[PDB]
Amino acid sequence: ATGDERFYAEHLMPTLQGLLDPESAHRLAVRFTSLGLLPRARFQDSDMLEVRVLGHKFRNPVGIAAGFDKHGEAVDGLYKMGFGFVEIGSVTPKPQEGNPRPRVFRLPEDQAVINRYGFNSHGLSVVEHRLRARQQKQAKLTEDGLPLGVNLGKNKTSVDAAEDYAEGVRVLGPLADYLVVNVSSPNTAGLRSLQGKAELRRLLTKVLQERDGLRRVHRPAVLVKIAPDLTSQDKEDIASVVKELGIDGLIVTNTTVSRPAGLQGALRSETGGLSGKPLRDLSTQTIREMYALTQGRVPIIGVGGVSSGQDALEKIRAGASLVQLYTALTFWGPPVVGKVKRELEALLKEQGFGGVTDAIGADHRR
């Protein structure tokens, strides 16, 4: 490990977290990232890390999860940090404020965060114009193996959820390599009920019809992002609908409304979704389940508690073609990205994989 990893993780990040409230810290991180003030990313991506999935090349399989760059303000800075792909959002159709502050909480003793942002969003129009300002730059980045995802949400007061997602497809679909139908936020009343069979089939049929209506060059993959808190029945139903409709992939998982035994943080009983280390294995097991239920035929982006190459490889072997992280970045800072990639490469070599692709779903073949 480099000196930068150690300096950020042991000294700089904990010191700055001691000085700044969580949401102020988030806002500054977005600002710093957008301005390119981040440290120099030393790690040069080897060919072993390249993945071809969702109609795209990914230079490396480590992405930034939704919720960091909600409004598409820091996309280029995130690629500079060494992410293989960037997901922005969630974006709602109309601007909305989200929940009252405070609404994000650190659990340092658990290496976890709880948030109840409630889809604070600049709205589709603002994000559309922000992405349009760099659309050709993104086209080159995508061609270079650096794709962009856009995660779509719904407004608090909307009377037609499916129409909110349809609007998102129409407005941001033409600017995205993939879209995410986020039906798994724990912070919007009734949202997770859209994961149910009948509601999901009707919602996703409408989303896919809208996507299919876009011009070929502007036609994104469509993925559904699911909760870690689903029943076995819920998961079976989602798998069935995904296969019936030809949904392009799954993002597994969002934050958990569970509070695993053993959390130590003083703020453990705050309302919201829990992320970071306590979510890690719940997410990995959900990936494993969804891979098996879809016969390994549906690409999965694995997310929840990834902080190391081992964490990444466990999700890949469970069935993820790509992984994302967020909470680890908040604790260990920008050097965590290079750390995960370097460790992942080393472990792939150690376990006799030719590359990431060879390891996808490997546990199921043991």
Ligand SMILES: Cc1cc2nc3c(=O)[nH]c(=O)nc-3n(C[C@H](O)[C@H](O)[C@H](O)COP(=O)(O)O)c2cc1C
């Ligand atoms: C502060 C915060 C805000 C988030 N906002 C969103 C969001 O807007 N949309 C979304 O799909 N997921 C959101 N997430 C969930 C992350 O994308 C990810 O699924 C989850 O945090 C698990 O990954 P992690 O343990 O690496 O953070 C958010 C997570 C956090 C911690």
Ligand SMILES: C/C(=C\COC(=O)C(C)C)CC/C(C)=C/Cc1c(O)c(Cl)c(C)c(C=O)c1O
């Ligand atoms: C600009 C700062 C550190 C530099 O590191 C970064 O920019 C990384 C996090 C992208 C200081 C602000 C801090 C300590 C941010 C860490 C942090 C946080 O402490 C918390 Cl709680 C959250 C929710 C976020 C969301 O991104 C977060 O980034």
Ligand SMILES: O=C(O)c1cc(=O)[nH]c(=O)[nH]1
């Ligand atoms: O905006 C939020 O509250 C949010 C959305 C989401 O999908 N997941 C999450 O943990 N928080």
